[PDB]
Design a protein around this ligand. Structure first.
Ligand SMILES: CN(C)c1ccncc1
Length: 281
């Protein structure tokens, strides 16, 4: 059981050590398309690249590249698209990916400004009456409603394909209170937020995979997917204590590099799963 293993690593202060074992054990696959010089401007960080095997393609014949990975968890029957925070020049690409993959939800785990720098372009409208047109991808985006709570905001958006005049409702789940440094003290607000995304039906097999992002799409984004998958595996298995969080993280790293950036994020993920398991048992 991981609750016991938590006290072990904690009392022995071994988090840096576990985390390094995971670093060394993690898959390494080619990322050739990401490093093409034509794609340099489409990447927020030169050291964070999708693997060729798991990358999302845009359907535009011109240049199909976006910094986005499909994570398929076969036993949990859960998929996720992890992506970087959009750049000023890739906001149209982001929404074209959301349109093509038939996603129902976008989960955002960062503020647009953190530590006095832009972590992300402002890629959605701030006012009902000021909609956004992405000329490069022929899409229109409208704010329908916005529900601001203490720890997170939920927004209702209409995405319209100007080419075919089809429209879809997108839910934007924005966690607003992840601290600039370190991790939340308690995982309660994060778990609440994750249960709210689940309730929406954004994580359901009826729809395309949820799109999850922070700045790089590996740290906070990793914690989100890891917690959701582990909790779902605990519902599904005859013995819930058979779920090894290190095994699940390693399976997820076959699909995108660097998921969980720090030993703090690893500790927080254990804590989120352990606490979440109480609300599930
Ligand atoms: C490469 N990169 C992070 C950027 C591209 C375009 N505008 C601002 C930043």
């Amino acid at each position: 059981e991981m609750e016991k293993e938590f006290e072990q690593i904690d009392k022995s202060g071994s988090w840096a050590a576990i985390y390094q074992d995971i670093r060394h054990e993690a898959s390494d696959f080619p990322s050739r398309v990401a490093k093409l010089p034509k794609n340099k401007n489409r990447n927020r960080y030169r050291d964070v690249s999708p693997f060729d095997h798991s990358r999302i393609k845009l359907h535009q014949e011109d240049n199909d590249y976006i910094n986005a990975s499909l994570i398929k968890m076969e036993e949990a029957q859960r998929s996720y698209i992890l992506t970087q925070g959009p750049l000023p020049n890739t906001v149209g690409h982001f929404w074209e990916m959301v349109w093509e993959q038939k996603s129902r939800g976008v989960v955002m785990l960062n503020r647009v400004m953190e530590k006095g720098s832009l972590k992300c372009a402002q890629y959605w409208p701030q006012k009902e009456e000021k909609e956004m047109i992405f000329e490069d991808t022929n899409l229109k985006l409208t704010l329908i409603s916005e529900d601001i709570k203490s720890y997170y905001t939920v927004r209702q958006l209409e995405l319209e394909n100007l080419t075919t005049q089809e429209t879809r409702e997108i839910l934007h789940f924005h966690y607003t209170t992840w601290p600039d440094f370190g991790v939340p003290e308690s995982p309660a607000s994060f778990l609440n937020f994750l249960f709210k995304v689940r309730e929406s039906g954004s994580l359901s097999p009826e729809h395309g995979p949820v799109v999850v992002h922070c700045s790089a799409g590996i740290g906070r984004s990793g914690t989100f997917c890891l917690a959701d998958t582990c909790l779902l595996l605990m519902d599904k298995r005859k013995d819930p204590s058979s779920v090894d969080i290190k095994k699940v993280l390693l399976e997820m790293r076959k699909f995108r590099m660097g998921l969980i950036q720090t030993a703090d994020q690893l500790r927080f993920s254990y804590l989120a799963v352990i606490e979440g398991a109480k609300f599930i048992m």
